[PDB]
Amino acid sequence: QPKTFTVRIVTMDAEMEFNCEMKWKGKDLFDLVCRTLGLRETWFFGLQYTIKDTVAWLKMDKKVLDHDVSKEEPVTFHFLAKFYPENAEEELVQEITQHLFFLQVKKQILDEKVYCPPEASVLLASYAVQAKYGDYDPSVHKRGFLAQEELLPKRVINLYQMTPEMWEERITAWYAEHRGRARDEAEMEYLKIAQDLEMYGVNYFTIRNKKGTELLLGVDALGLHIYDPENRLTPKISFPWNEIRNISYSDKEFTIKPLDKKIDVFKFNSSKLRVNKLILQLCIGNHDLFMRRRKADSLEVQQMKAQAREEKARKQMERQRLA
């Protein structure tokens, strides 16, 4: 007989309970979760618990129990995108994948984790209700239907010169134009707009230089960024993954070694053995996807993009040759 314990897996819309074996590893669990979800573009996600201070990602090598995760049943893990694509419309094939990104980012926008200007958030909110509510209908969708709904982040609505349900018009004006858009199509549209945001998909970290000046570290799909803590939108310097050769780390200091030794050598301190772990994990991660993007698609990927090419034209031929 196989002995086991229970776990809860929360997604941006679901919550699952599972029977993870005692001696099971991070990978074993993860995969179980990816399968029941029907998600195969796994490389973007990972499961995450949280102590209270530094947060963590389930390691595919260690036993799920060995991770210093709160052991009270049901053990909780949040299924989330750890990595972000440089171009969603080209890198997210599965609607499932797209969906999980759509909802996650939406929350990041709404809770103001990622800065979004007024006009944009309005456009965004307009795509969100097209996915949720479907095509517009002046009759069914009477004024006020978007009263209390959490559509724009709390900062733009507090842009005083405009009133609560006035915003409802601004959004309803766009939504009207979205007629004919599929739930998943509207979600992708939301993403296109989102990719472009200055704070989109960037991991922020607190680090300081060898002289003691407080800076900000940015780890993302594009490279390694050094920011002025008073400006999260625009980096002072940027180190693309293809421009860097190596990233050493001794004691408590990272030392970005750029290729072209004729250029430079940057360095910075940060002390928290866990964050410094996160930073590293994230580095190799973004480093490979970045590289894989540049190169030819793996059979695993090229097959997916094909399935989509065939199950799109299919829906298209059986729609025309059926009317």
Swiss-Prot record:
Q: Give the UniProt entry's GO cellular component terms.
A: adherens junction; apical part of cell; cell body; cleavage furrow; cortical actin cytoskeleton; cytoplasm; cytoskeleton; cytosol
Just give the chief location class. Answer: membrane
What outcome is recorded for mutants in which this gene has been deleted?
Answer: Mice are born with abnormally small lenses with serious structural defects. Failure of lens vesicle separation and the resulting changes in cell organization causes lenses to herniate, leading to expulsion of lens fiber cells through a perforation in the cornea. Developing lenses show loss of cell apical-basal polarity, failure of the lens vesicle to separate from the surface ectoderm, failure to properly exit the cell cycle during fiber cell differentiation and incomplete terminal differentiation of fiber cells.
Task: Offer an example of a GO molecular function term for this protein.
Answer: actin binding
PTM comment, free text: Ubiquitinated by the CUL4A-RBX1-DDB1-DCAF1/VprBP E3 ubiquitin-protein ligase complex for ubiquitination and subsequent proteasome-dependent degradation.
User: What is the membrane topology listed in the Swiss-Prot or TrEMBL record?
Assistant: Peripheral membrane protein
Biological process terms from the Gene Ontology for this record are:
actin cytoskeleton organization; brain development; cell-cell junction organization; ectoderm development; hippocampus development; lens fiber cell differentiation; MAPK cascade; mesoderm formation
List locations, semicolon-separated: Cell membrane; Cell projection; Cytoplasm, Cytoskeleton; Nucleus
Q: Which UniProt keywords apply?
A: Cell membrane, Cell projection, Cytoplasm, Cytoskeleton, Membrane, Nucleus, Phosphoprotein, Tumor suppressor, Ubl conjugation
Q: Which residues form the FERM domain?
A: 5-294
| Assembly information from the UniProt record | Interacts with NHERF1, HGS and AGAP2. Interacts with SGSM3. Interacts (via FERM domain) with MPP1. Interacts with LAYN. Interacts with WWC1. Interacts with the CUL4A-RBX1-DDB1-VprBP/DCAF1 E3 ubiquitin-protein ligase complex. The unphosphorylated form interacts (via FERM domain) with VPRBP/DCAF1. Interacts (via FERM domain) with NOP53; the interaction is direct. Interacts with SCHIP1; the interaction is direct.
Role summary: Probable regulator of the Hippo/SWH (Sav/Wts/Hpo) signaling pathway, a signaling pathway that plays a pivotal role in tumor suppression by restricting proliferation and promoting apoptosis. Along with WWC1 can synergistically induce the phosphorylation of LATS1 and LATS2 and can probably function in the regulation of the Hippo/SWH (Sav/Wts/Hpo) signaling pathway. May act as a membrane stabilizing protein. May inhibit PI3 kinase by binding to AGAP2 and impairing its stimulating activity.
Q: What is this protein called?
A: Merlin
Taxonomic source organism: Mus musculus (Mouse)
